[PDB]
Structures are given as C-alpha cells and as structure tokens.
Design a binder for this molecule. Sequence first.
Ligand SMILES: O=C(O)c1ccc(COc2ccccc2C=C2C(=O)c3ccccc3C2=O)cc1
Lengths: 253, 261
Amino acid sequence: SADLRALAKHLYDSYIKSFPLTKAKARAILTGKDKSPFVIYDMNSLMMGEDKIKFKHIKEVAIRIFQGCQFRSVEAVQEITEYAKSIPGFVNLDLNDQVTLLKYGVHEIIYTMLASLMNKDGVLISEGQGFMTREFLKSLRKPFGDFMEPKFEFAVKFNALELDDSDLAIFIAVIILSGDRPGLLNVKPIEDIQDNLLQALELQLKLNHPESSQLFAKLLQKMTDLRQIVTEHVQLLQVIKKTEHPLLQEIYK
Amino acid sequence: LNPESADLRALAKHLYDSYIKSFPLTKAKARAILTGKTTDKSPFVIYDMNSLMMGEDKIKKEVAIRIFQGCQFRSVEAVQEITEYAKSIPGFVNLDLNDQVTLLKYGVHEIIYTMLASLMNKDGVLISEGQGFMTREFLKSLRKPFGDFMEPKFEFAVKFNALELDDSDLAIFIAVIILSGDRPGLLNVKPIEDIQDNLLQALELQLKLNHPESSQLFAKLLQKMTDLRQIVTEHVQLLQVIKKTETDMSLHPLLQEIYKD
Ligand SMILES: O=C(O)c1ccc(COc2ccccc2C=C2C(=O)c3ccccc3C2=O)cc1
C-alpha cells in the first residue's frame, strides 16, 4: 500500500538534518528573497573574498580554488555518510558493502547536490554566503578551467526537471543503493532496498508533480550523464596530479 | 483497459511489428538456436583456429584482423536495419533531417549492443544469421588489441539478459534509445522529447503487463543505458588504438561517421 510515503517523509526529514543548505534555501539566495552573498567574478574579487567570505581551507590562485573544492568534497562526504546511515536497511548490510556503496557513490551524490547550488551563471559557495561566477571558473588555466564547466552543463539540464528536496532525498538514496558497484559481496539486499526506494521515488514524483509525465523516467536517464560526469572528473583528477606536505595529501583521496 | 492505455498498446503493437520486419534474427529465434528448440537448426561452433577454417566450408590474411572486418560488415548491415526500423517510429521521419541523422549517429552503437545481447549467452555469441557460434574464450584468445573488444559486450549481455526481456519489450526500448534529446548538436529538442515521453509511457505499460511479477523492471531497464554508453566509450578508445596500430587496415565509411566522439 501507500506505506511508501512513510519512507518519503522519513528520508526527507533526515535530508533536512544531514544537509545544512537545502535546495529551497539555495534557490532563494540564487533568485532573491534576504541578506545577499559575496560575488567572485575575477582575480581581485577573489582576494577580497578570502577576507570577507568564510574560506577556512588555507600560493597560486587556480590551485587554491581546486583545493577549496576538495576541502568541501570531504565535508560533503561526511554529510552524505550520515544520511546513508539513516536509509532503512543500510546499516544492517555487510560493513564492507556499506564502504563500497559510499566509496563509489559519494561522487554521484556530490554533483547531484552541486546542481542545487548552481545557476546558469555561477555556483554558491561557503553555505550560500558566496557566489563564484561561472565565467570566472572557465577563466582558469590549463586543466582547471574545464573541471567545473562540464558540471554547469549538467546542472542546467538537471535543474530543468525542477525537483525539490523531498524528491532529491529519495533520488540520492536510490544512488547510494546501486547494486552494480564493483566488489559487492551481497547484492540481493542492496537491490531489495533500492527497489523499495524506486517505488518511493515514483510515487513522490507523480504526487508532487502531476505536471510532468514520465518525470520518473527522465530522472533515471540523468544517472547516465551523472556517471559520465564522474568518469571524466577522475580523468581530470589524474592529469592534475600527473603535473603540479604528505599529511594534507593523506587527508584527501 | 482504457483509451489512455489502448493508445499506448496499439503503439506497442506497431513498434513490435516493424521490429519483426526490420530485423531478420529475433531474440526468440536466437534463444531457440542457443538453447536447442526443434523450431530451428543447430549452429556450427567455433572455438579455435582449427574449427575456424571449417566454418568456411559450412558457413558463408591475418585471422585477428579477419574476425574484426567481418564484425564491421555485420555492424554496417545492422545500421541499415536500425535505420529501417527508425523510419517506422511514429514521428521520427517528421523531425528535422539533420536531427534525424544526429539521433542515428549516436544511436546505432547503443542499439547494436542491445541486440547483440540477444545473440549471446555466457559462453559465446551467435554469428552469420545464427548458422555459427563463436565461443567467448576464443574471442579473448585473439591478438593483443583484438582480444579486448568483445568481452565487455559479454559482461553487459549476461547482466542485461537477466532482465529476461523478449522481443516485444526490446522493440519499444530500442525505440526510446534512438529518440533521445540529450545527443549533441540537436536543433529542435522539444519534438524529440515529446515522442520519447510517448515511447517511455508505452514501455512502462508494456513492461508492467508483460512482466507483472518483476518489481520495477522499468527503472532497472532504464539504468542499463549507463552500461551501454560506457561500452561505446570503451569501444571508441579501442578504435583509435587499432587505427594507429594497423595503419594498413581499413574501416568502413559508414561507421567512420559514427567515428567522431
Ligand atoms: O563475413 C565475414 O567474414 C564474417 C566474419 C566474422 C563475423 C563475426 O561477426 C559477427 C557476425 C554476426 C553477428 C555478430 C558478429 C560480431 C560482432 C562484433 O564483434 C561486434 C562488435 C561491435 C559491434 C557489433 C558487433 C558485431 O555484430 C561475421 C562475418
């Protein structure tokens, strides 16, 4: 029966608790209500940002922008981990499987939620207190100007579906419970959970959006472009370190 | 039973029937050859270089290059078959002509491996309209670059064939792969999306009616496209290696057009 909604409300509740900056709060900053946010659009507005913005992650500018993204990546992984532990059935699985689920999942979820803080002209940074210009992100050089641009192109198409947090909570739960991650020992319970999650997502979309026919299908189709983005991201992550203090190097992966 | 559904089910019958008249070797006949139904003859199995020279006498230099350029002519013939099917998808021939070729350009490869799964089990693949069967371990035993082409399709086919789709489901699923709006360089995307919505609505109904005991087969089938597009990327990466390894070997012009990223 419609017990699916008890699941939908449960995960949305944990979504609000795990993630401080929600999508509704991010579009309001983006759109405009408020109390604004610092805008970084060139080289000098960057150095002023490190004085007024909340940059807690610090001698060349294109590298420091990449290090800051890597710093918040490991921040998001902790928030994603806490939310996964609230997905019913997750903590009861094999412990090795929980690791590999998160190991191969956090990237797809990072960029899914990055689209929430991204308009067509830039991205919100530092819990919405700053806004880095998209044109300034391609401004970079060598390999850096392209690391963020393919995600803008993804965010534009993903945001056109106009999903809210109640939809995204179930969606990312479906991503974590992917039974096709390499090295899984017990796939059956993972697929059993994800199927229960897909049922929840299909009912959520048809209820929340009688607008969009087959929006469930289109959202599933985005998981294709969501693994192509993660593929070419690590394709860039090895071109950077093929070029360019082991204790910060150990903090990151 | 309702006019909403009657529309989509008539659309399913239409696609299923163009499917039959576009593709000579259905999955139903393939499964008959591969398991051993009396409705079909039995293939000649090729597992080493010895049984290869015997296929010439039964079924219609450099052996590693040979199997590949027979793969090429097979892909060419299927692109023709895929095109004939695409012309039957309601609305497709009414979309912009350069968008028509854009859908086919990025579409044929994803269709090929879907239909290639119908000719496969875990042990090998049917070849030459079902008269032959080339074992999977013989294909790996091939030369240093050529031994790597086929096994990714084998890994996908076994996971994909586990969905247990029959030709009725594939006809609609193949139709939704051709008509997708995210392919690059598309001029007008909205008419393409309006047709795909119809096709996916037809697939959703067809899967729930044909496979009513399989929970959420619609969702699991759609995510198999992430597997298809990675196979295409691995394939392209092997084509740029062979193009510089064997600079004496030719590639078909038709596939040389799908051959641009
Ligand atoms: O006339 C000759 O001498 C000839 C030689 C070898 C083959 C074997 O070939 C196939 C034949 C039928 C069905 C499938 C294949 C094999 C393949 C692939 O290996 C492949 C790889 C990528 C896309 C499509 C295909 C495909 O259809 C065919 C003809």
